[PDB]
């Protein structure tokens, strides 16, 4: 008689997605962003915009009944960057304190086999 | 409010892996729930404190009134896990 | 005008200006308390000597250091109320007489108006002035970004201070009303948290700056 | 409010874009925090015994 969730982080350095489904996750129970927290396009990726999202989230699955979630951090990926953004253990930390267990925590992190070829030319970004 | 409107349900593990509880999931409809898959690991269903990085993958194939049974479909290790295994020389 | 008996007076008892004490007076702040100086003292004149020393300010009597705030022009580089306050030849810079005999004024209008201690009135105008966190610039890898930081007490007494000071200077500036009286309005205002203190409305704009910072 | 009182314990070093900002270590008096020990950059002089109303105890300086 637990409730138990999965949290899953979409953290990159654009933004962050706070997304708390069910334990098979085919039942959306809250989503939150950093862009409905913060007014600006630069502090969406922040860690605070990570923790007030986070918050929030936290807070509309303990009123729905959620008691515990199991955390899966993921950055983009494929042929994307591979690293987490700046606002993923920020949002771990505000899941954890705002009054959810925590339970498993893995990275889940599309990992390509050599797969496509990246944007940007051979050259790359020339800033 | 669609909240109220969705029931919860009991995943039960398949038979030869003890029929244990593994967790709840909410659904309005109990045919939604039929093709479900949820993740758990070997130390939660058996008890084994060794092997937490083997995850298995449960797959719903019938509802009987709040009671929905699983198949077995995949196991896995865990990502970490080879990474620490795999090295060079 | 003033009676011979205050243009003569004469005190027997140790204590700020012969008139008011300070044993009564209490600060609950627990950053500010250590840095606030209420030291059985008469005359509140140590001619400096606490410049040369690191966290000398922390020896000086409240009341000198707000007389040697109010020893100013009121505004030079920056501007207070939207105007300068460029006072060349009739400021009170390095008039410390003055100074005193104003703060002596206001304090006497400041315990008229309350009916408490004016020290005690001022100690809770600088704890209601008084900001708890600002905002700072920090440069890593190759750029610069805006972080929210905290106010050591020394800083936060003496921003307190300059806001008293300044709120004061902007309301006795080209107006009928006197230094001594602006000075009194000032801190009456901050003391009871009404937003027409310049000190109080000083603190507010940077706590909100530095909440929208973090 | 009314913030969190902290006692400064140790400091880090000189910090910010011309110096004038100090990182330490601080912990909390009070508060649901009792007894951790986390850190803060800081404006102003400080020294060791000095003690700031932290306006909340979540977020952590990073090391220098």
Known sequence: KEKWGIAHIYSSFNNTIIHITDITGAETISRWSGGMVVKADRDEPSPYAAMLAARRAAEEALEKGIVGVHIRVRAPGGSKSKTPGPGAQAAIRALARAGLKIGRVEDVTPIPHDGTRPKGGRRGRRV | ?89 | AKPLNERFFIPHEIKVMGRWSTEDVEVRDPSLKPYINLEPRLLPHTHGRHAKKHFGKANVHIVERLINKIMRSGGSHYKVAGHFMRREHRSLNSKKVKAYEVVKEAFKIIEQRTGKNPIQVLVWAIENAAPREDTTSVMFGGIRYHVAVDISPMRRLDVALRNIALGASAKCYRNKMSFAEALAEEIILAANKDPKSYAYSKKLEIERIAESSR | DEGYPAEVIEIIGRTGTTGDVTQVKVRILEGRDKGRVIRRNVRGPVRIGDILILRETEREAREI
């Open chain 2, 1 to 89: 409010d669609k909240w109220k409107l969705k029931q919860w349900y009991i995943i039960y593990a398949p038979d030869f892996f003890g029929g244990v509880e593994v967790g709840l999931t909410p659904a309005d409809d109990p045919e939604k729930v039929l093709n479900r898959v949820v993740e758990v690991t070997l130390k939660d269903v058996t008890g084994d404190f060794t092997k937490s990085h083997v995850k298995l993958y449960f797959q719903v194939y019938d509802v009987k009134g709040q009671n929905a049974y699983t198949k077995f479909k995949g196991m896995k290790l865990a990502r970490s896990y080879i990474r620490s295994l795999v090295r060079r020389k």
